[PDB]
Amino acid sequence: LAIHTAHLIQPHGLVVVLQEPDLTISQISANCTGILGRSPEDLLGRTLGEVFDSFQIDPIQSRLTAGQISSLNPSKLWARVMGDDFVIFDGVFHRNSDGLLVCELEPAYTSDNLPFLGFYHMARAALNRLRQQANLRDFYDVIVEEVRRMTGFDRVMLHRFDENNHGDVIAEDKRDDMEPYLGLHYPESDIPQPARRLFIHNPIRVIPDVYGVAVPLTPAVNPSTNRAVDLTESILRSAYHCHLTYLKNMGVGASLTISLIKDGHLWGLIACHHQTPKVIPFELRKACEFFGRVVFSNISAQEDTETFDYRVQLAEHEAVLLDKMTTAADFVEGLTNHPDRLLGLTGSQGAAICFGEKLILVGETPDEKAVQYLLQWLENREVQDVFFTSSLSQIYPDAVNFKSVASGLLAIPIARHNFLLWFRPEVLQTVNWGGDPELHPRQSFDLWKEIVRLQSLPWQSVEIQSALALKKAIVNLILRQAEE
Amino acid sequence: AIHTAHLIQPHGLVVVLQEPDLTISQISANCTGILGRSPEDLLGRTLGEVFDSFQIDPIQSRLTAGQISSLNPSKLWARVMGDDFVIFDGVFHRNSDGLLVCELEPAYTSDNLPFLGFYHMARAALNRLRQQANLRDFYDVIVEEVRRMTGFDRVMLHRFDENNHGDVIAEDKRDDMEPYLGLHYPESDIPQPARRLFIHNPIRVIPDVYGVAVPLTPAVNPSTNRAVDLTESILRSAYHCHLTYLKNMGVGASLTISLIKDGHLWGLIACHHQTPKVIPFELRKACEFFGRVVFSNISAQEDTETFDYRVQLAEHEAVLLDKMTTAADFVEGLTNHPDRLLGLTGSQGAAICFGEKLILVGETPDEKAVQYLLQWLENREVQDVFFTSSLSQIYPDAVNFKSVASGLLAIPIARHNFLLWFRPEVLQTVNWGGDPNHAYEATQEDGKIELHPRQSFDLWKEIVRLQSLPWQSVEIQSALALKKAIVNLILRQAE
Ligand SMILES: *[C@H](C)[C@H]1/C(=C/c2[nH]c(/C=C3N=C(/C=C4\NC(=O)C(CC)=C4C)C(C)=C\3CCC(=O)O)c(CCC(=O)O)c2C)NC(=O)[C@@H]1C
Ligand SMILES: *[C@H](C)[C@H]1/C(=C/c2[nH]c(/C=C3N=C(/C=C4\NC(=O)C(CC)=C4C)C(C)=C\3CCC(=O)O)c(CCC(=O)O)c2C)NC(=O)[C@@H]1C
């Protein structure tokens, strides 16, 4: 039933389209009858000034309004509705991709005492707590905790993205009684690349009533465009029923989502859920926007420093291996006497050393027969620098059999036939999520699981370079030995 | 300057490899002195032949950047005429022109050095940094720990301001070396080329400042009939202009680490040595990675502090909106909390012309000059808000009170009423005082200080006269908020 071509409006706010240069309402959201007590037929054709009874809005007239909008962007228009209640609205003007003038009106009130300053004071105090954390875990756990405190959502969670753009719920705070989603991985597909790239322009997604019935504009077709309006710019853009389904059968009544953007690419989300509907005012969205920026700034700081700590540990292995490789009469015998360090050098779980005729297996590797066949294959490939794959099963079909040990392989040709190999198993650390058994998280997880079949963790650049460093070091040692 | 005569620092060799045969099309002229074999001898030979090092199996076409990047670095060694057995670090890039280049820095041993020491100190540096309260303390630690890790006679931290003029924000040096801390240099002292180059080439090493630069022979690459672009080289010699600067500064070796945010150069870690001091591939790569994470924490600290301004400005906004409506006169509310009023736009003075009356707060010009100024503002017919970093530039009379109101932010009120904030010229926020008091340097104005820090400071000084600190976005919006509030207090004071 529900069409995918739904650029409609979440029903709590109004969208109006202003004709130029006359500044009359060319189209309006259909909920205007309820919200303004006046029908679309009544309002169609009226200038904004005449609708808002205070004539609050003073749009200085122009043939075209350009960047004058930026001035009007924080506007608090109000008009009397019922018993002279004088309902107020936060107003925000955009130019749609079609090039029309659009104004969005979210009803506002200052009933929430300490509405914005409070949030701001808690936010700085969050940032002090955050910066004083040692562990990155503790660090993440604090983000969600303090966001949830600040915001008051029934659930707040931190989503990061895999190197395949998949998902990983890396932190979470929720009611004791709610189901935990921590560790749940989900497919990249669950948030399509449009919605992602759209977070760059629209950094916050608010759905304060999930069950709210989306309303169109009337007339639906802009007169000038003879084409529908593009709500890409709107906060009130209604979300696609696909996702609402997901939320509904997850038990969600209101969402908030803060994008975490690095250098223009989406790093992760702060995804907030409420079981009850729950509105978030302009004021507090603006503050959330700014908070998420700085929160992410500290995220990327922590993430960066930790990933430099990997480079130290890999240097550590590199050094211990360079030492003991030259100590023991056979260099190979040095490597195999410190296998912890050898596997550690590329963050692998197994390895093989074919030097001349001999061949040594270390850690978790395939049976020697299957390995030998593999080496054979690699010399046929005639790899010049290095071979590495996150999914070996795809390129060497026979490796489907030992997917569980070597789905991932990195191999470096020491010589024409002498090679060094590192093996990774398919992702088995997914135990983090229950795996509990029709489009709901448990399904998404099962789908993600299907995708990661035959597939190891990705070979990080630092790991590869640290293996190349060992290869070149070995070659040089052998040359010196001959020269010796 | 423009001509960019592409020469080489003389300690290392640059070769240009023809493809697909990997023969040397061009070589640096120092090859005679360093390899004991002449350019005539070496030109045409494959690299493998010269350095007894595995010549890459002759590529199907050209060396893919995978093959090029896996090669980096490679240790090449050769015996040459006279028993000479010499080790080089080799490092391959392809030019913007596409041609392949290899640079050979003489090295001490054959086997790799993982810089474990450096890495252990770096790890420990980052723990120190994360535990720092003040941003100053924070910066001061960077330089200190870099200097420890690296062992330079001097390390300093340069941050660029909103026009890219330099500011030496931190520094660690030998006790009896001259301090450059607080020095501000004009953006010109690092030309926009060198800057835009740091985003692609993050590290600059000049281990011999006095070394005589050598060219390639032939100078003209046969494949381009064009001289060769060394932009991508480590061994690219720096322009004599800058070497002069270093020489007259007493430098024997320089290292520089770019600090890049969002693809724009934020600042430098500029390292100086009195003696020559080389930095190997290995240790550059470690430095490169260190500077990234160091900067990552810098931008984290910088960001959080600048959002602390947003909270404090919200705080002023709220207290001012409260007390403005409490006291019967809104003006009387503003003047009872002047700390908060100046604080709202991070200014040092303010003026309130409502109707007839006019109230000066903090540091402002004399009433006569202010009154003339208000007059001027009505003539401007300011629509939303007026703000300028240098008022003296557009209102000439303001040259007189430059030292109080070089910067002005004004919000007009109808009936000729106005709110003003004043900022002083930025000459007292920073007082490096490189010239001894009123040094009579002008006497004997032969530009003797040509290419000298002091000169740069005097140049920068000339640029920043008549000029306040820039009006930050947050500050303007906080003032607009007060404008809207005042308009809505005039409306509610209907009487
Ligand atoms: C439809 C066939 C597919 C689809 C489309 C779709 N998804 C989104 C947006 C989001 N989806 C998620 C996913 C999750 N949120 C959670 O809390 C969890 C459990 C931990 C998951 C898996 C998220 C975070 C978003 C964006 C954030 C938000 O709540 O706004 C959209 C865009 C909707 C819009 O217009 O903003 C679309 C179109 N989702 C599916 O599940 C199908 C595979
Ligand atoms: C020549 C007419 C002008 C000029 C050109 C120029 N400068 C650079 C590079 C740098 N200049 C500096 C400046 C300083 N370094 C310091 O230590 C200090 C004192 C605190 C100053 C003022 C710096 C940091 C650099 C870049 C870092 C480095 O050492 O590499 C270049 C580029 C040289 C190259 O090819 O890499 C050029 C062409 N410099 C002048 O002083 C003239 C105004």
Residue numbers in the entry:
A (entry chain B): 18 to 454, 468 to 514
B (entry chain A): 19 to 513
Paper quotes:
In prototypical phytochromes, photoexcitation of the dark-adapted Pr parent state leads to chromophore isomerization at the methine bridge between rings C and D, followed by thermal relaxations and conformational changes in the protein, eventually generating the light-activated Pfr state. The underlying structural changes include movement of numerous side chains and sheet-to-helix restructuring of a tongue-like hairpin extension of the PHY-domain. Remarkably, the single substitution of conserved Tyr176 by His in cyanobacterial phytochrome Cph1 increases the fluorescence quantum yield from 2.4 to 14.5%.
In this work, we have addressed both issues on the basis of the crystal structure of the Y176H variant of the Cph1 photosensory module as Pr. Even though the resolution of 3.7 Å is modest, refinement with the Pr-like A-conformation in this region resulted in substantial difference signals. The B-conformation involves concerted changes at Asp185, Leu201, His202, and finally, a “tryptophan swap”,2 where the space occupied by Trp450 in WT Pr is replaced by Trp478 and Phe475 in Y176H. Pfr-like structural features of Y176H also include the interaction between conserved Asp207 of the PASDIP motif and Ser474 of the PRxSF motif. These results suggest that the overall rigidity of the Pr chromophore in the binding pocket is greatly enhanced by the Y176H mutation. Thus, Y176H represents a mixture of a Pr-like chromophore configuration with a Pfr-like protein structure.
